[PDB]
Design a protein around this ligand. Structure first.
Ligand SMILES: *[C@@H]1O[C@H](CO)[C@@H](O[C@@H]2O[C@H](CO)[C@@H](O[C@@H]3O[C@H](CO[C@H]4O[C@H](CO)[C@@H](O)[C@H](O)[C@@H]4O)[C@@H](O)[C@H](O[C@H]4O[C@H](CO)[C@@H](O)[C@H](O)[C@@H]4O)[C@@H]3O)[C@H](O)[C@H]2NC(C)=O)[C@H](O)[C@H]1NC(C)=O
Ligand SMILES: COC(=O)[C@H]1[C@@H](OC(=O)c2ccccc2)C[C@@H]2CC[C@H]1N2C
Ligand SMILES: COC(=O)[C@H]1[C@@H](OC(=O)c2ccccc2)C[C@@H]2CC[C@H]1N2C
Ligand SMILES: *[C@@H]1O[C@H](CO)[C@@H](O)[C@H](O)[C@H]1NC(C)=O
Lengths: 214, 211, 211, 211, 209
């Protein structure tokens, strides 16, 4: 009725005001004094192509990214019980998580939209097709081939951005059942590197996939 | 000539009243939206048995209705609908769940808005998706499927529906390398252990064989 | 002498400011778009996917009262070149493409004082075409319709000046020779709806260049 | 000395602001422009006899002069030239008339502007164009040609010139799959049956053979 | 507690505001760009077109007086990360590419309080290279020069810290093994023209593994 109509109008107004209060009335990225931990997890959907002439393999996966900022916190009571909202990834800071051994620019398969929750947590899940350095020799064997690719910030050291995983098991529950390649194992493991150049520690998540022709 | 100038004026006024004035932030649990989807399959262009990818060309009809897009035609020279850039309005984030390449858009990004607040948007797309074409060279043919739905909105914010579960095949290319044996489009509701919300998709299932 | 050149520059800048400082056609204010093709090359015929690649220049012409001016009010300027982004342009689309059109020319149009616009995009188009018989005397025949994506014949009409495609610039050393090429206005109806839909059907008969 | 360097930056920022922010609508019949063109051919990368397309890599030197880009160096700390993004200034729409794919740009889009109003802009490009490479595997080689000129400006608005009819081969890749027998670049006044006003082009003719 | 973090953010926002409120190098205000390559992979060698595809990280470093600050004035901030669109970057270009470079990393740079900027684009490059001999003990040798497209040595000098390409990240299971890889500053002089031209010549000797 008129009341219900008003409730929907109010909710829209509350959401606009919240987004206004948060964005254009107020993030420069993490710092050594304010470091950020980004949680990463992979959902491997398909090994599309294994190219033995170039040693490039093409994966399709969803990369779940999570982080939390005090600057994105709000009290739902102050905004009509809004507890989360969807917003363009361009409206907010997002981490520069990059494959370290790609051979072509990553191709994005999903909308650039994130979910922000009232505790300041952000969830962003880009689907990607990636070509990366991988020798598929042995893919036509019982033990298959094994390849790996590291993901992490391009420009922030372990001083500013840390990474974590919730599990070292890649999510395979959406893996394409009729892929040319069957997955024997898939793991995701945080690593901390020290290079002789630099005093800063460097952090990545290493995606290791063991696979064979089905 | 002055009559047409007035019609031009009424349309510019309508669009400015609706857009450059008035703030729809997308759907929410308190203001949920139903998007109607329908496919018109034009061609299976390519089936790649080395990678198990198949390439489709189709028109994806999308329809939804917003109170914020309603007007009284009597206040605007009896204008009952208009065409506008899809960039001028909210559009749903309907995504193929098992694509293997970014969708390629084949048509202009323009929508039709009607006075009741309904919007119709029909992007033509070329899609590569995960599909094993084994059997395509047999009488039984091959069967593949791809789900479409919102990437970021659950069934609490966006629901989906179809007007028919039969894919429109009236524009299917008569001399395609592949003949269609059947094509269906079916709403599915899924509940996951992770999550209390329902998740909705439209499953496009195509059975086809070499012609 | 160069004083005159400064004055002509200022007049043109003032004209463009006055014109640019249109919501598309409507049933009350319909527009006729004239189309014509200049076929330059059949680049590729792919029998594995039934796609053929053409390179052509597509002539588009239309006329808007809103683009009219009196040359005497603007230092006798009769026409100007401008970015296609500065003006409304018709959403003329191939109906059976299989890849996005690739644009081969600058997106710049010519506007004349009577409000007429001429815009000539060069394009490479892949479209649905079975090239069977291309290696024979009779050759292969394919066709592709072009028209508005979103406007009916009650908002945009189409016309051609001739039903003969211009072949005078067709590449003399193409892999494919043209047997004929026509461009024909068609009026289509769909069962749901009383309004006519208009397209221009490009039909090309061709064979491999070699009794 | 660091004071001097700060002054130089200030002077350049002020010059650019004066030229771009506080001050050209392209050439016209009253104010026509001459563009000088010159090609430096770097490589014939690929010759495709299946589609009759050949791929070139070259640098295209473009030079023109505008009164609107003139300054007195004395008013700007003796600055005689500057580099600037090609987006900041008008640039000519020089286009290959027989490309089969959009040209791919290989160099930064930055031009050099000199105090007399002259501009030099040298885009490196990879171009696929219409070319039958028959004879490439013989002593006499293959011959192909491609015209470059304005897409939309007739010879009444844009004229072209060359400094030499000899293509610069001094940077030609010495281990290319193809050796160059000759390469010429020749101004032409080109009449099209579509159009009463001629267009000016520079015709690049390359004779080449497998190494 | 969190007031400390609220302060550091405010300090960084203040710094970025003060710095971003430069027209490129000139003969009067010249710049030095240091370049270094980390060669990751020879992906493809195409003997039908004489094009070879490299993947590498290209380190670029320069310093601007205009980007200097005292850390003590901004809560001891000594560096920050910023979009490469926020700042001037050098027009370093391969001189014999055959396709546009494809960028594999985010366009973000690090600015340090001494005015130095480090920008490290990862790239895939196709360039002119004849792979003949790659299947022999001696392998094949190719080369590609990198340098500014529009600035002479009077505006941008180039240099390398070492003439040895960094091979410590070279892909161990590449189709091609690297025999040597050098990056060498070259100065070119022409009779027409007073100005020196500078490039860094990347020379790679490689063979089938
Ligand atoms: C925008 O669109 C609206 C809606 O269609 C138009 O408004 C209509 O205008 C027509 C034409 O003037 C009207 O038709 C006339 O209706 C009369 C009776 O009207 C009463 O009854 C109707 C229905 O119950 C009510 O809607 C209305 O409010 C009235 O109470 C007839 O007597 C008229 O017939 C006579 O005139 C015609 C010529 O016009 C002759 O040919 C006949 O022989 C006869 O002498 C006539 O049919 C209609 O009532 C209006 N509809 C509504 C809903 O208001 C606008 O005209 C249109 N344009 C603009 C600019 O707004
Ligand atoms: C800004 O670029 C980097 O820091 C990269 C890289 O940096 C370099 O390779 C490099 C090269 C020359 C000088 C300094 C750093 C190290 C690790 C691996 C990828 C990424 N990274 C965090
Ligand atoms: C505006 O487009 C043109 O003038 C093109 C072309 O125009 C046409 O082909 C054409 C066809 C029909 C009507 C008007 C122009 C003429 C020459 C060749 C390419 C380009 N041009 C300089
Ligand atoms: C345009 O030309 C006509 C020719 O008589 C002339 O009368 C008129 O003054 C000119 N218009 C101006 C604005 O230069």
């Amino acid at each position: 009725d008129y009341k219900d109509d008003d409730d929907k109008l109010h909710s829209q107004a509350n959401l606009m005001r919240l987004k206004s209060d948060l964005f254009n009335r107020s993030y420069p990225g993490p710092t050594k004094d304010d470091p950020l931990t980004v949680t990463l997890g992979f959902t491997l959907q398909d090994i599309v192509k294994a190219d033995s002439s170039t040693n490039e393999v093409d994966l399709v996966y969803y990369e779940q990214q999570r982080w939390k900022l005090n600057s994105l916190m709000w009290d739902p009571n102050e905004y009509g019980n809004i507890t989360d909202f969807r917003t363009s990834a361009a409206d907010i800071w997002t981490p520069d998580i990059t494959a370290y051994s790609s051979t072509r620019p990553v191709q994005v398969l999903s909308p650039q939209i994130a979910v922000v929750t009232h505790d300041g947590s952000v969830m962003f899940i880009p689907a990607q097709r990636l070509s990366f350095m991988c020798d598929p020799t042995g893919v036509d064997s019982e033990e298959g081939a094994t390849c790996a690719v590291k993901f992490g910030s391009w420009v922030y050291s372990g001083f500013e951005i840390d990474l974590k995983t919730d599990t070292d098991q890649v999510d395979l529950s959406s893996y394409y059942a009729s892929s040319k390649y069957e997955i024997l194992s898939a793991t995701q493991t945080r690593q901390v590197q020290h290079y002789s150049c630099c005093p800063e520690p460097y952090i990545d998540v290493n995606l290791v996939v063991k696979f064979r022709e089905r």
